[PDB]
């Protein structure tokens, strides 16, 4: 279980 990315750096 692992969620979708919404922010990056």
């Amino acid at each position, epitope marked *: *279980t*692992i*969620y*979708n*990315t*919404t922010l*990056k*750096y």
Partner: antibody
Amino acid sequence: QVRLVESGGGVVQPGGSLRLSCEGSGFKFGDHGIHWVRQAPGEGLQWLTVISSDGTDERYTDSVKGRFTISRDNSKNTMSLQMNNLRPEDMGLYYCARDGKCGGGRCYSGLLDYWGQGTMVTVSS
Amino acid sequence: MEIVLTQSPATLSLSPGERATLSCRASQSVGGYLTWYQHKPGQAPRLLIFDASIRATGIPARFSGSGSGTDFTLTITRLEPEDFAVYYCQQRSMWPPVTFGQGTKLEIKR
């Protein structure tokens, strides 16, 4: 067994300062970014800041940049928050909250999958 | 700019056994990135539903999430006493800031 524990809250005077800590356990601390969310007495929830899994990125809400600085020490399952120039606006209960595992790259999911109970910040004269 | 979330109603008063229907309105599409948390007094807030419709682990089936874009619904079918709490919606489509709804309080009708 996944746990998060906050500490370091107390009472201070306006203009005073504070250092908050959040302690993770039950998981690979460095695998997730950590958030702080606050709840002012009789109010809802407000997001404040997050630090990335690796400790390289940090984001703050408008209201507190310049005042608060977030950091972490993955070697110790630990992050902290230095709060300066405390106002009445800052009074409330502070929760550390885990950013759900973004599969990844240099990511943040924005999902708060585990929250702590909170530590209290009181601002008074 | 930041998505303002609006929750309705502010207080919801029902009886155990009834169906509850809660709404969250975004100011602009959040796509499907909408989460719901349950919050009891002096307890740690808890993740219920993520991505509008996915039940998190441990969360029972009576909790249902639906919606897309700007209008979202949290439904609880056979209300039990422990479902009486405060429910918040949250968005992760456009951040920072992460943004929340003002909360809907679910109270026992008697």
